[PDB]
């Protein structure tokens, strides 16, 4: 759920998902088009088609289970969408701790009009 992808997020970057991550540049939070503004913008769109992936699941509403073994994200064992939803949100949070070292604050609230370009999933 989006809930927890939040908790994960503060969990991997010490950065609170709201509002370090919800308005971030092209692709992190509400929608999504055009050229992905830096890395860290690369991971929400990359999480997107992640999520694009899972028609018939809810990744916004359905909670799924981890635990931590050492520093690492493991899914544990839900529904296939639960599983599937997990590494998903898995896969963004450890993308966003790579990517920490560029993160730029003036992507955050980033206009929808300057979206310009586009990319495939």
């Known amino acids: 759920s989006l809930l927890e992808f939040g908790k994960m997020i503060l969990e991997e970057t010490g950065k609170l998902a709201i509002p370090s991550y919800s308005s971030y540049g092209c692709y992190c939070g509400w929608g999504g088009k055009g050229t992905p503004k830096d890395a860290t913008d690369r991971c929400c769109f990359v ?21 931590r073994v050492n520093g690492a994200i493991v899914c544990e064992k839900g529904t296939s969408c639960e599983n599937r939803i997990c590494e998903c949100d898995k896969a963004a949070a450890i993308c966003f701790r790579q990517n920490l070292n560029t993160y730029s604050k003036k992507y955050m609230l980033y206009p929808d009009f300057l979206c310009k370009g586009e990319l495939k999933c």
């Open 47 to 67: 999480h997107d088609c992640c999520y694009g992936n899972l028609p018939d699941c809810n990744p916004k509403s359905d909670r799924y289970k981890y635990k």
